[PDB]
Design a protein around this ligand. Structure first.
Ligand code: A1ICE
Ligand code: A1ICE
Lengths: 116, 117
């Protein structure tokens, strides 16, 4: 599993459950092509997005649909979504975890890039 | 100018992030991202004067902060291409917006401070 997404809720102190996540890969004409998607689990995680074979070097965007998460909770949000855009690089470690910490008017994201 | 301000900080050096390029886009009727304004952060890490209250109408706006180029100029190969901030503005009338971003090579944070003039 070369790409995992983990989402936490800074208001409730919990995993962010049932958050839609869409991954795109940038195409040669500079548009964003759909690549993978899912909803976070009860642990706030989304696994199984891609395989080592398909996750080749390139520019990827992970959109986390934060507005619909906050709206379901009755909390006014600022952002439409959180976007995380990065280049995948074969010279580095083999596993990418995109972690995001969500608040109604703020988010933080970090990448944890590791080698099993 | 006051309707839209961007402030960028460097969490490695404990300093403003100076000379950072910022591009603002606005979603058009055809759902594409139309250029709206751009600039660079000052020596205080701040970018003022991007727009006016008249020009900054209701819409969906995207503030791209070109963090990758900032880090490369300091010798660091960072994770992210940019920090993007996408939001609906002025849906309940004009507001002032400060978009603050705190940068590290493999992480960023962003917060919005929204005031009613
Ligand atoms: C301040 O932390 C930030 C800031 C920005 C983005 C992410 C984080 C935290 O990442 N969390 C990781 C994590 C993993 C498992 C559990 C668990 O076992 O419940 C809890 C937490
Ligand atoms: C933990 O703080 C975060 C987290 C995310 C994004 C921004 C910040 C800080 O910016 N906020 C306020 C601020 C204002 C002026 C200065 C100054 O130039 O002295 C420094 C800080």
């Amino acid at each position: 599993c070369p790409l995992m997404v983990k989402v936490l809720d800074a208001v409730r102190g919990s995993p962010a459950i049932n958050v839609a996540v869409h991954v795109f890969r940038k195409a040669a004409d500079d548009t964003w092509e759909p690549f993978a998607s899912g909803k976070t689990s009860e642990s706030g995680e989304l696994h199984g997005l891609t395989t080592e074979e398909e996750f080749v070097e390139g520019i990827y965007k992970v959109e986390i649909d934060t507005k619909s998460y906050w709206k379901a909770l009755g909390i006014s949000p600022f952002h439409e979504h959180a976007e995380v855009v990065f280049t995948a690089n074969d010279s580095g470690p083999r596993r990418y975890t995109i972690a995001a910490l969500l608040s109604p008017y703020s988010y933080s994201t970090t990448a944890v890039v590791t080698n099993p």
